[PDB]
């Protein structure tokens, strides 16, 4: 790509952290130069604090401005709780059910073994639990999970794989628990 001129980056992050609905709220305003946070306002502290030397003059200056501090102190209500209410019904309350499929892997590394894949896709929110069972008994060894993959479009996916050495008659179950369903989803593979 060329153009190796030096670059200089300034980032601001106003973070509203919500605990138990909006029972407890913490506002953390952060200023970041390049990759280093320089100064922050933490509503649990109630005034600006420098994080590095570069942020010292800003915290000193902003802390001398009474109206500024009063607005920042009330922002847990006028900003965080306000914005939480604006979007609650389509963010906090968004629930999209996973699509769950089970299939043997197209590539089978070992003879007499069957790598099974449980694909859990399209869901929201990210909190999910995916388990494998063999004849009804949970497999707590031999399981590989890709972990939670955020797709960038308000959906997630995950893949959970089990190496079996199956016998005819055995029944393997992938079980998914997620806030969008009241009972676990299960998909079975019969060896």
């Amino acid at each position: 790509m060329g153009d190796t001129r030096p670059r200089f980056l300034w980032q601001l992050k106003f973070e509203c952290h919500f605990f138990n609905g909006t029972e407890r709220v913490r506002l953390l305003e952060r200023c970041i130069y390049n990759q280093e946070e320089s100064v922050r306002f933490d509503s649990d502290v109630g005034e600006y604090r420098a994080v590095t030397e570069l942020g010292r003059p800003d915290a000193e200056y902003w802390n001398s401005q009474k109206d500024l501090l009063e607005q920042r102190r009330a922002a847990v209500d006028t900003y965080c709780r306000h914005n939480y209410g604006v979007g609650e019904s389509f963010t906090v309350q968004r629930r999209v059910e996973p699509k769950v499929t089970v299939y043997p892997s197209k590539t089978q590394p070992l003879q007499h073994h069957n790598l099974l894949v449980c694909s859990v896709s399209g869901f929201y929110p990210g909190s999910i639990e995916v388990r494998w069972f063999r004849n009804g008994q949970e497999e707590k060894a031999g399981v590989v999970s890709t972990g939670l993959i955020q797709n960038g479009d308000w959906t997630f996916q995950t893949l959970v794989m089990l190496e079996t050495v199956p016998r005819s008659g055995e029944v393997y179950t992938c079980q998914v628990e997620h806030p969008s369903v009241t009972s676990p989803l299960t998909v079975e593979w019969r060896a």
């Binding site: 980056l9 106003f14 914005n83 990210g126 960038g152």
Partner: protein
């Protein structure tokens, strides 16, 4: 033990003269402001039927952010950013079935500064039909992530690559995908 986090994230980058303003909820974008068209762009279309945001407020913040960047550049005695190159992964959004529409996702993660060149290639040739992408999304370590998307019809005869260039890389990174 937090349940949720909403972040208003902004940046300005020189000498590119590039700014961004977005809101994030639990790591997903709610909206950003298009700096050129000067309008609010909702990440899912329906959000614009449920809420509003005055885009001119973002432009006013960005002007302040540009001026502040200049202040910090001088205050740091012109210390520039250290490039951090991205990690790139390509995956589909659902299990692949022959001739069943799907989407390829190119996930570009853990990089800074927020300037990248991304191209989808099919059989080595650039493809743009139906592609889309996100703006630069924040990370807790202050690096960035980004997603590019390519709807496609799986086939045994096509292979794909996500080609990514960034200042922290000395050569283009080509992340490959083909029907298994």
């Amino acid at each position: 033990k937090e349940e949720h986090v909403i972040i208003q994230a902004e940046f300005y980058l020189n000498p590119d003269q590039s700014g961004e303003f977005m809101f994030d909820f639990d790591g997903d974008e709610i909206f950003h402001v298009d700096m050129a068209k000067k309008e609010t762009v909702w990440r899912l279309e329906e959000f614009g039927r449920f809420a509003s945001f005055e885009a001119q407020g973002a432009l006013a913040n960005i002007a302040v952010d540009k001026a502040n960047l200049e202040i910090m550049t001088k205050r740091s005695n012109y210390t520039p950013i250290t490039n951090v190159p991205p990690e790139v992964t390509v995956l589909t959004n659902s299990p692949v079935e022959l001739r069943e529409p799907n989407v390829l996702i190119c996930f570009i993660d853990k990089f800074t500064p927020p300037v990248v060149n991304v191209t989808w290639l099919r059989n080595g040739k650039p493809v743009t039909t139906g592609v889309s992408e996100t703006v630069f999304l924040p990370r807790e370590d202050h690096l960035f992530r980004k997603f590019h998307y390519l709807p496609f019809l799986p086939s045994t005869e096509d292979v794909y690559d996500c080609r990514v260039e960034h200042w922290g890389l000395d050569e283009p990174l080509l992340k490959h995908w083909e029907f298994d």
